Design a protein around this nucleic acid. Structure first.
Ligand code: CL
Ligand code: CL
Ligand code: CL
Ligand code: CL
Ligand code: MN
Ligand code: MN
Ligand code: MN
Ligand code: MN
Ligand code: MN
Ligand code: MN
Ligand code: MN
Ligand code: MN
Ligand code: MN
Ligand code: MN
Ligand code: MN
Ligand code: MN
Ligand code: MN
Ligand code: MN
Lengths: 95, 108, 99, 88, 95, 109, 80, 99
DNA sequence: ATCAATATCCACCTGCAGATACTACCAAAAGTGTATTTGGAAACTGCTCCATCAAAAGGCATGTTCAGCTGGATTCCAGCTGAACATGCCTTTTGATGGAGCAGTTTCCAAATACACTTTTGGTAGTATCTGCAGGTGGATATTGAT
DNA sequence: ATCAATATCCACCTGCAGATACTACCAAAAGTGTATTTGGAAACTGCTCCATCAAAAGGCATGTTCAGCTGGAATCCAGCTGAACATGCCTTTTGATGGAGCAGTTTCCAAATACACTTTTGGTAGTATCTGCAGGTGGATATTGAT
């Protein structure tokens, strides 16, 4: 029946959050969807490498954090790390 | 019921990222926190760019973000530009920049 | 006596004009034929989605524009304002695209 | 009429002097030497062969006859030239 | 105990074949081991990519072949593909 | 049947069984076919021979018996194809190719 | 006297020589040191990140090798 | 008149001598001191395998040497034979290190 | 052309860091036997969309003329950077002792996986209707260049 | 500085491609519940090898003097390359149609995973012998540079 999922609806939600009255052309949305996928891939691959390098068979939030530190530069890294730590800490605070 | 994104306070899909992590062959196991953390970083990054792009669209008096706005914000941001140094944004053009030596002067 | 802008004035107007836009600068059909010809010499009977050819054109133009920025730095470094073959070659060599 | 399909040759000359001038302008170039045009065509050709060769290899591996935007996008990526805007 | 494998002994054998009376220093052996590990990793990762792009769950000799065509320069590719096909065929006509 | 290792069957010096294990444990794909490790082992051995073959001659053009890092560097950077394959690689203790820009040589330029 | 200055004019001259450099301007030595410093900060930062992740207090050759690889500067003869 | 080699002669002698060898060209200790200092800013009381410090020196010098080759080409593009900071600058910019 | 001052090379020599040959031991790597699961090749085909044809037209390529000003050549000389020395600071080594901590080992449990059900959702397909902005006009202001 | 030929800016406007909006359908996604397996954190520790010393021995960095020759400033000018213009083509655009081929759906077995069990082997360790070649000495001769 054909199903190709993307991050468009989520990128849209975030956009409405930061610019409630700003839209986005489908090409721009296409660029953003490529951006989000690129980030996912780069981080997962680095986490994957981190796991192998330490003989671990599990990718945890810790490998992810380290991947983020290795991949993002200065300020971006710091914020991404907070945002991630926060999300995890809040996630575990729930049953 | 109550989704993990909601439980994590995120817009980005925790469940899907978790699945994508499993399907990607990155490790034998993927802990529950992994996709939460990654989804948070993905959203944070998309929010940063959209924040900047939305403002550029505003400076040019447009209410719709197009590729050009993404390209402008990315190339003017020292960190976003390094993170994406090897990326090409279709229909983004380049940053206006004319070497000083190429400008005229000294009358004639 | 007719109006003539001086040598370089129109050129600067064009730099500002194309740096402000994002459209493709190479004619579409002619580029598509170039792609088909090069692909055909690798494998015959190939078909292209129209977006495959557009992806190549976007990548080719981003690539040539960027190379021209570097070439331009090599010329200016030689104290010229005219880009020459040796400037492109210098840039491609430092870039690792060559030997 | 299916016969004598148009023969493709010398298409690299489709990249005209005016088109190369424009790209150079977007690149901030003010003055262009007469020999830049052929050099550029040569450079573009090498670029395209490398990318198209890899894209076609991806196409053939998938046992297809049609080159997809993804094939190209995958081809660009393994060459360090990631492209946003066409999928993946 | 303490075990750490490498391709050293196999590299050494290959050396003796082509040059029976030539030795190799340890530092050079180390470089050859890195070389072989690097080739393995580049081909394996690309083979991984081709299978993922095509929704295959199996990395078969076909993926290795394509990976080699994409990674090795002209002539080296031609030959490596020969060596490859030759070893799979020899191996098949057996038990 | 007296066992003849998969390497011996393939007629290779490289460890087809080890390479197979490394493919699996490297998270490359859910399943790894029988041919893959064979083919891969063959490609690796081949490249190892191409380099060892060259480096061996380089050691004899220097009147030496033992291949050293310098030898590997010279054979790799003097070979067009091997140089491209390893353009991003640094060979510890390899040094560089003797090469002096003509314009720097004696009497003008 | 301090550390980056520890990389001497003559050592820098030797490196340049290996690079085929015949004549060196006086301002080169300080430019070089700055370049070497950015190169090491970039590589070491990543090595240390690999050290910390492994919960160690010792930077290993592999940590460096892995650091070099992700900077696109693959190094042969120290492991991996 | 005592014996003096002309300016450039010993230099060329040196190019030939160091392009022929593979020895490390920076003094070990001074180098190791630098490493530890830089590392110290990211993490304190770090120890280093002697081989780690050796990989860093091997990579650092290969890097510098390679950079000097590109810088030399930039000096020559400007019709000079003396490398200057702007030559190092142009090379790093074209390589994407400064860009 | 002559010849002195040095650098450079070849032939030979010899200690020793480092490569080598042999034995002993064992975890784990690797192959074999068999029983079960399943990826994905075949075969058939729905349906997207790629190739191709048609016709009109004006946006833009092409070829040309003209001359402004850039590049390339030449000349000149101030002063930076190389060569050679005299000092002597500090790296290098090697010998050897604490001890930090890497790496191996035994426990043990929070968290992962597998499995069965159930509830929610993001993607789409069919249809319709708004709205941001591209492209055009027309007049006001700005920039460029000749005097 | 003034005047004119043009480029550039901006307000106003209109068509419409793209964006957005409900209605509806459901296959895969995602969450819940229990049960069963296990990765690797935590604590203890043996021994590998990293940090610090000691402490000469001298290799090599640093400061200095001198001037060769390079970098860069100043000039001159042929002719390349930019601007403008006439001409007209071929790319772009709009709409249509066949059909190649990409992709969805079901069937089915060769090949892979999952395991138990036996056999083989690459790696660590000891103890011990051998050897390619670094580094040193002579003496020959090539190179460089002053006459
Ligand atoms: Cl986790
Ligand atoms: Cl040229
Ligand atoms: Cl296979
Ligand atoms: Cl400078
Ligand atoms: Mn052809
Ligand atoms: Mn199935
Ligand atoms: Mn004239
Ligand atoms: Mn000039
Ligand atoms: Mn302890
Ligand atoms: Mn919904
Ligand atoms: Mn408009
Ligand atoms: Mn366990
Ligand atoms: Mn003087
Ligand atoms: Mn000069
Ligand atoms: Mn015409
Ligand atoms: Mn068909
Ligand atoms: Mn054995
Ligand atoms: Mn010797």
């Amino acid at each position: 029946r054909k199903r190709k999922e993307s991050y468009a609806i989520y990128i849209y939600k975030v956009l409405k959050q930061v610019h409630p009255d700003t839209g986005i052309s489908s090409k721009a949305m296409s660029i953003m969807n490529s951006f989000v996928n690129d980030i996912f891939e780069r981080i997962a691959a680095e986490a994957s490498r981190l796991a192998h390098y330490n003989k671990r068979s599990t990718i945890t939030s810790r490998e992810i954090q380290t991947a983020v530190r290795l991949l993002l530069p200065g300020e971006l890294a710091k914020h991404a790390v907070s945002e991630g730590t926060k999300a995890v800490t809040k996630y575990t605070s729930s049953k | 019921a109550k989704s993990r994104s909601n439980r994590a306070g995120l817009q980005f899909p925790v469940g899907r990222i978790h699945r994508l992590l499993r399907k990607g062959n990155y490790a034998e196991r993927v802990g529950a926190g992994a996709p939460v953390y990654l989804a948070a970083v993905m959203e944070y990054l998309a929010a940063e760019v959209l924040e900047l792009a939305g403002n550029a669209a505003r400076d040019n008096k447009k209410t719709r973000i197009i590729p050009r706005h993404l390209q402008l914000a990315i190339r003017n941001d020292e960190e976003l530009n390094k993170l994406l140094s090897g990326v090409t944004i279709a229909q983004g053009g380049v940053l206006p920049n004319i070497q000083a030596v190429l400008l005229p002067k000294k009358t004639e | 006596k007719p109006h003539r802008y001086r040598p370089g004035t129109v050129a600067l107007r064009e730099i500002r004009r194309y740096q402000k836009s994002t459209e493709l600068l190479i004619r579409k059909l002619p580029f598509q034929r170039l792609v088909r010809e090069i692909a055909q010499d690798f494998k015959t009977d190939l078909r292209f989605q129209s977006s495959a050819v557009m992806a190549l054109q976007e990548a080719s133009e981003a690539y040539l524009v960027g190379l021209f920025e570097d070439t331009n730095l090599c010329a200016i470094h030689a104290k010229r304002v005219t880009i020459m073959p040796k400037d492109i070659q210098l840039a491609r060599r430092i870039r690792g695209e060559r030997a | 009429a299916k016969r004598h399909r148009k023969v493709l040759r010398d298409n690299i000359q489709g990249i005209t002097k005016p088109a190369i001038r424009r790209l150079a302008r977007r690149g901030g170039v003010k003055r262009i030497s007469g020999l830049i045009y052929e050099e550029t065509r040569g450079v573009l050709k090498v670029f395209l062969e490398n990318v198209i060769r890899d894209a076609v290899t991806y196409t053939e591996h998938a046992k297809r006859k049609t080159v997809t935007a993804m094939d190209v996008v995958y081809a660009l990526k393994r060459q360090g030239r990631t492209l946003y805007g066409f999928g993946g």
